Amino acid sequence: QEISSELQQSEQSKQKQYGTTLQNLAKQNRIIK
Amino acid sequence: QEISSELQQSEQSKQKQYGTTLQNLAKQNRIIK
Amino acid sequence: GTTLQNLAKQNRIIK
Amino acid sequence: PDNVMMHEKKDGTLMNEFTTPILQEVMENSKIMQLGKYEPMEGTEKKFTFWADKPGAYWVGEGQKIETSKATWVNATMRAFKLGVILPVTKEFLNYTYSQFFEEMKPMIAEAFYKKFDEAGILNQGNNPFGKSIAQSIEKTNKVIKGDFTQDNIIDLEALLEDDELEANAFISKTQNRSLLRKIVDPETKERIYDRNSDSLDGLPVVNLKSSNLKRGELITGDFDKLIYGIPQLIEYKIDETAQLSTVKNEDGTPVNLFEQDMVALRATMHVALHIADDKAFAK
Amino acid sequence: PDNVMMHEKKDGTLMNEFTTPILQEVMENSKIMQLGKYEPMEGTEKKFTFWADKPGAYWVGEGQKIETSKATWVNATMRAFKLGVILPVTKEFLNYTYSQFFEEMKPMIAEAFYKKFDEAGILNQGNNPFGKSIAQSIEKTNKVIKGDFTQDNIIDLEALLEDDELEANAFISKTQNRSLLRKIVDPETKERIYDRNSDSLDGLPVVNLKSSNLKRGELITGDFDKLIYGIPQLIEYKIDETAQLSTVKNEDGTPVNLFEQDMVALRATMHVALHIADDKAFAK
Amino acid sequence: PDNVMMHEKKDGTLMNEFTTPILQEVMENSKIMQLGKYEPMEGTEKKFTFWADKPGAYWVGEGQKIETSKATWVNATMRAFKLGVILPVTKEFLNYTYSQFFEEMKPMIAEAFYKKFDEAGILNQGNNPFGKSIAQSIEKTNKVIKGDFTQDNIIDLEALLEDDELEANAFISKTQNRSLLRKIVDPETKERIYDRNSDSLDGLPVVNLKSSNLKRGELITGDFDKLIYGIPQLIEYKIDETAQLSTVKNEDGTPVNLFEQDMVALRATMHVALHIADDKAFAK
C-alpha cells in the first residue's frame, strides 16, 4: 500500500534523471569544448 | 584521554594536508612555474 | 641516491 | 512492455531505449547543435541570468547591478513523406516488428527534421520562429561588416564581438563561400589560414552550413543555449496531406494515392544572447 | 554528518570534500591567481616575503637579499541571487540531495567570486579595497607612459621596471584592446610581435581579467600574494536584499517576489608589490 | 633511528628517505641539470679521458695516446628564512611532524637553490664560481657569430662545433628570444623551422633561461656533469646575522624580533668540455 506507491515513484524518477545523462553524452559529440 | 589525543593529532593533520595539495594544484594550473 | 640516478635521466629531455 | 513481438500499432510514443539512437543522428548532423550547450527543463521554463558583485560587510560609493527572468516554449513539427511514399502497407512492417521499424526510420525522418531547425535557428527564413534568431539579434545590435574578403575579415569579425568581453569560438560559413577562403594566404608571413586537413580557420572550430539562403556570409558565436524535451511521439493514418503537394497540381487524395503516412513532432526550443558578429557582401 | 542523504536545510556549511572542487574552479576563471603565489594562513599569520640569495661557503655574501614583514585579513561575500531565484523551492532540491546541489552550483557561484576579486584586486574601481591595489602602487612609484603602441615602447616598459629589482613576468591587457596588437608591423624589422595562435606579447604570456574599466592597459607584476582559505559557508534566506536590484526600479520584496537566496561568505586576501608598470591613452 | 612522531631537533641532518624527494624535483626546475648528467662519487673525484687502442701484433703504432686527470669539488651553503619564519607556529609544524616539515620546504628552498645554480653554471655573474664553464669557454675559444636570424646561421652555429667532432645536441634560448624565432622561413623549402606547439628549434629541445642577461642568446652544448652528493642538512639558530638587512638601513636583530633562520649545506659539481657556441646581436 505505502511501500508500493513509494517504490514505483522512485523507479520512475531515476529513469527521468537518466534522461539527463543522454544529454551529457551529446555534449561529448559537440565540437566546441 | 592519551589514546584519544593521538587520534586528534592524526585527524587535524590529514585535514590540513588537503589544503596544501590545493596550492600544489594551483601551481600546476598557472602559466609560470 | 640510487633511485635519483635513474629518475634524473628520465626527467631530462636529452637522451 | 513491448520490444519485438509485432507492429500494427498506428500510435507509437517512443521508448527511451529507441529515443537515444534516433536523437543522436538528428543532433550530430545539425550545425546549431554543435555550437550550443544544453540543459534539461520542461515545456515551460524559468531560468535566470546575469552576474553579481558584493563586498564582505562594507559600504562606500555605489555598485550597480541587475537580474533578468527568461523562459522557453513551443515545438517544431514536420512529416516524413520520403518515408511514407516508400512504404506500402503495415502488414509488411508487422513482420519486421516494432524494433526494426524505428531503426529503419533512423536515416529517414532524422535528416529532414534537423534541416528545418537550422533554417529557423541561425537564419530567420522558415515559418517556425519563437525566441528571435542569431540573424535577428544582429539586426537589433549592429555587428555589420562591409563586403570584403582578405585577412582583414578575421580582424574585423572578432573585434566587433571583442568589445563586449566575449571571446571568439565558432565559425559558421557555407560550402559555396568555403571555396573562396582556400585561396587566401598571408601577405608578409608565409602560411595559409583555412585548411581541410586541419579543420580550422584561425585555429578555431569551423562548421559548414548547407542552407539555400545565404550567399557569401560569415558568423562567429560562443555562448548559446538549446533545449530538447519530451518524446518524438508517432501517429500514422491515411486521410489527407495538406502541406505536401503531389508534383504537378493536386495535393493528395490519400484513399486514391494509397500511401502509409506518419506524423512526427519533437519539443525543441532555443535561447539566445544578444551579442554576435556577422559579415556579408556589398558590391553596390 | 552530511553525506548524500537529503537537503531541506537552510544552512549548509561545506565539508572539505565538496569545498576543494569549487575552489579549484575559481582558479581557471581567475587571472590574479596566475600572477601570484598562494602561501596560506588561518585568520591572520605574520609570515614573511621576498626571495633568498646564497652567500656561498668560499666568499662572503656582500650583496643584500632583504626580508619584509606582512599580515593581512579580509572576507569576500557574494549572494547568489540568480542561483537562489533559479531554485523554485528547497523541497525540489531535496530530490537532488546535498551532494548534487553543489555540483549544479559549481560553475556558477565561482563565476561571481572571481569577477569581484579580480576587479578590486588589480584596479581600484570596485568598492571593496583593503591593502592598496596595483593601480594605487603605480601612483606611488611612477612607471607610467604616454599612450603609444610600438615595438620600442614595449621594450622600454620592461626596461623601466627592470631598473628596480626584478624583470617582467607577464602582461595584463584587455580582451577589447587586441586590435592594436595585430597592426604593429615595423618597417626595419618586418615582423609581428604579438602571437595569434598562442597568447604572448613579446614572449611573456598574456591573460585578461575581463573587467569593464580599462581601455589601453598594460600591467606587469610577477611578485604577488593571493590567499584562499576556510569554507565558503552556505546560508539560505528569504526576507530582504538591499545590495541587489530587481527588474528595473524596486530593490527586492522577498515575501511578495517568492524566491530563495544563497548567501555565501568566502574568505580571500591579497597583497601588492611596490614597482608595477602601466600605460594609458590621453591625446587631449 | 629517527621516527615521524615529533619535532624538536635543531641539527636536522636529512636521512636518505627524505634526501631524495627534495633533490628529485629541484632538477625539473634547473636548466643546467637537464643539459648535463648525473652520477655518484666518493666525495671528491678525478676523471680520466682519451682512447688507448692497438691491434694484436701486426705492427706497432707510430702515434701514442695521452692519459690525463680532471677533478671536481666545492660546496654551496645557504641560510633561508622560509620555515624558521614560521617559528610562531612551529608547534603546529610539530603536529605536521618532521616528515611534513620538509615537504612544505620542497617547493621553497629548492626554488631558491636552482636560480642561484643556473647563474653560476651558464652565466658568470653571481659570486659562487668554481667550474668556470660556459661563460669562460666563449672567451677562450671564440665561437661568437654576428646577430642574424636565418637557417644558414643555425647551420653555421652547428658547423663550428661540428668541426671538432662534437654533435649538436640541444639549444638554450630564453622566452624573449622565442618571438624572434617566428620569422625564420627559407625561400626554396617554405616551412616552419621553430614549431609553435612543439618546443624545438631545429628538431632539438629548447630551454628557457629566466635570468635576465642574454637578450637574444642561442647556446649549444649538451655535455655536462652536475651532481649533488651527501646530505643537504639543516641547522636552526637565533643569532645576529652580519650578512643581512632588516627594513631599509638596519640589521636583523634576531634576539628581539622572534625570527629564525634555516641553514642548508648543499653540494655542487661542474665539468667543462670546451666546445660551445653563442650568438647575440649585430650592433644594438
Author numbering:
A (entry chain d), B (entry chain c): 40 to 72
C (entry chain b): 58 to 72
D (entry chain D), E (entry chain C), F (entry chain B): 26 to 309
Paper text:
Like other tailed, double-stranded (ds) DNA bacteriophages (order Caudovirales), the 80α capsid protein (CP, 324 residues) is first assembled into an empty procapsid, requiring a scaffolding protein (SP, 206 residues), which acts as a chaperone for the assembly process. Many SaPIs also cause the redirection of the helper phage assembly pathway to form capsids that are smaller than those normally formed by the phage and are therefore unable to package complete phage genomes. For SaPI1, we previously demonstrated that this size redirection depended on the SaPI1-encoded proteins CpmA and CpmB, leading to the formation of a 45 nm diameter capsid with T = 4 icosahedral symmetry.
In the T = 4 SaPI1 procapsid, there are four subunits, organized as A5 pentamers and (BCD)2 hexamers, which superimpose with RMSD = 1.5–2.9 Å. These hexamers sit on the icosahedral twofold axes and thus have strict twofold symmetry. The SaPI1 procapsid map had the internal protrusions previously attributed to dimers of CpmB. Closer to the capsid shell, the density became interpretable, and was modeled de novo as residues 41–72 of CpmB. The C-terminal part of CpmB that includes the RIIK motif forms a helix-and-hook structure that is almost identical to that formed by SP in the 80α procapsid, and makes similar interactions with CP. Contacts between CpmB and adjacent CP subunits are more extensive than in the 80α procapsid, involving several additional Gln residues in the α-helix (Q48, Q51, Q56). Each CpmB dimer straddles two capsomers with legs that connect with the capsid shell. There are two types of protrusions: one that ties together C and D subunits around the threefold axis, and another, weaker density, that interacts with A and B subunits, connecting hexamers and pentamers around quasi-threefold symmetry axes.
